[PDB]
Amino acid sequence: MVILGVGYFLLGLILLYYGSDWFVLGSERIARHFNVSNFVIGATVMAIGTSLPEILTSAYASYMHAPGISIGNAIGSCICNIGLVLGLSAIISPIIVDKNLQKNILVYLLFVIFAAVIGIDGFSWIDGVVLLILFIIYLRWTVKNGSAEIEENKNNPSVVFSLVLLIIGLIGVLVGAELFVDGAKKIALALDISDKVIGFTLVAFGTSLPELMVSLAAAKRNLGGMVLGNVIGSNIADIGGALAVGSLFMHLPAENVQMAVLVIMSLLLYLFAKYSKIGRWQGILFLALYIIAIASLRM
Ligand SMILES: [Cl-]
Ligand SMILES: [Sr+2]
Ligand SMILES: [Sr+2]
Known part of the structure; x- marks a missing residue:
C-alpha cells in the first residue's frame, strides 16, 4: 500500500x-x-531462536512441493553467516579462540563435511533424520563442556x-x-x-536478518564469543534443523556448488581459529568471498 x-x-x-x-x-x-560461556548460550538458545525463520520457511517450502527453495534457503543462510555476519563482526570485535572452542568448531567442520558428502545424492528424509539427531547431541555436547555443575x-x-x-x-x-x-x-x-527473484531472495535475506542484527549487537559490546557461537550454532541449526525438516516432506535436490563453498569457508573458519586470529583481515576476507558468492553463484 x-x-x-x-x-x-x-x-x-x-x-x-x-x-x-x-x-x-x-x-x-x-x-x-x-x-555458561557466551559461546554456548549463543550456540544454543540464540542460534535456535534466530534460525526459527529458516526452519519454518524450509518446512513450508519443502511441503509446498518446492524443495529447491528449502535447501537453497538453508545453505544460503550458512554462507551468509560466515561471510557477511561473522565477517562484519570480526572487523568490529576481533576474537582469538581458546582451545576449548577450537574443538567445538572442528566438530562443526566435520558436521558440514558430513552433510556435504551425504548430500551429493541430495537429501532423503533419512538423510535428514540423521542430521537432526547429530544436531540434537551437538547441543547437549556443547552445553556439557560449556557448563559447570552448580546448585x-x-x-x-x-x-x-x-x-x-x-x-x-x-x-x-x-x-x-x-x-x-x-x-x-x-x-x-x-x-x-x-517478480520471482525479489519475492524470494529478499526473504532469503530476511531469515538471516535476525543473525545479522543480533551479532552486530554482541560485536559492538565486544561479546565476540557469543557472536562466534551464534554463527556456528545457527549454521548447524540450518543444516540439522531447517534442511532436515525439509527432507521429511520431500527429497532435497543436490546443491554441490553451494555446499563446496560452505565447506571451504567452514574450513577457513577452523584454520583461522586454531593457528591464527579472527580479526580485521580475516573478516575482510570473509566479506570478499561473500561478495564473490552473491556475484557469481546461480539463480
Ligand atoms: Cl565473549
Ligand atoms: Sr536465521
Ligand atoms: Sr543423499
Missing part, C-alpha cells in the same frame, strides 16, 4: 535495532546465571529480568525482521517492481 509498506519498513528496523540489543543483553545475563536453582528478580529481556528481544527481532520483509514487498508491489 506504500506507507504500511514504509511505516512498516522503519517500524521493523527499530524492532531490529533495539530488539537485537535486548536479545543479546538477555542471553548474556542468562549465560552468567547457568554459569542450580527461585523468584530471583534478577533472573526474571534476564528471561523476559531475552524473549522480548527475540520477539523483537523475529517480528522486526518479518515487518521488514512484509514491509519490503508492499513497497515493491505498489510500484510494480516485482
Whole structure:
C-alpha cells in the first residue's frame, strides 16, 4: 500500500535495532546465571531462536512441493553467516579462540563435511533424520563442556529480568525482521517492481536478518564469543534443523556448488581459529568471498 509498506519498513528496523540489543543483553545475563560461556548460550538458545525463520520457511517450502527453495534457503543462510555476519563482526570485535572452542568448531567442520558428502545424492528424509539427531547431541555436547555443575536453582528478580529481556528481544527481532520483509514487498508491489527473484531472495535475506542484527549487537559490546557461537550454532541449526525438516516432506535436490563453498569457508573458519586470529583481515576476507558468492553463484 506504500506507507504500511514504509511505516512498516522503519517500524521493523527499530524492532531490529533495539530488539537485537535486548536479545543479546538477555542471553548474556542468562549465560552468567547457568554459569555458561557466551559461546554456548549463543550456540544454543540464540542460534535456535534466530534460525526459527529458516526452519519454518524450509518446512513450508519443502511441503509446498518446492524443495529447491528449502535447501537453497538453508545453505544460503550458512554462507551468509560466515561471510557477511561473522565477517562484519570480526572487523568490529576481533576474537582469538581458546582451545576449548577450537574443538567445538572442528566438530562443526566435520558436521558440514558430513552433510556435504551425504548430500551429493541430495537429501532423503533419512538423510535428514540423521542430521537432526547429530544436531540434537551437538547441543547437549556443547552445553556439557560449556557448563559447570552448580546448585542450580527461585523468584530471583534478577533472573526474571534476564528471561523476559531475552524473549522480548527475540520477539523483537523475529517480528522486526518479518515487518521488514512484509514491509519490503508492499513497497515493491505498489510500484510494480516485482517478480520471482525479489519475492524470494529478499526473504532469503530476511531469515538471516535476525543473525545479522543480533551479532552486530554482541560485536559492538565486544561479546565476540557469543557472536562466534551464534554463527556456528545457527549454521548447524540450518543444516540439522531447517534442511532436515525439509527432507521429511520431500527429497532435497543436490546443491554441490553451494555446499563446496560452505565447506571451504567452514574450513577457513577452523584454520583461522586454531593457528591464527579472527580479526580485521580475516573478516575482510570473509566479506570478499561473500561478495564473490552473491556475484557469481546461480539463480
Ligand atoms: Cl565473549
Ligand atoms: Sr536465521
Ligand atoms: Sr543423499
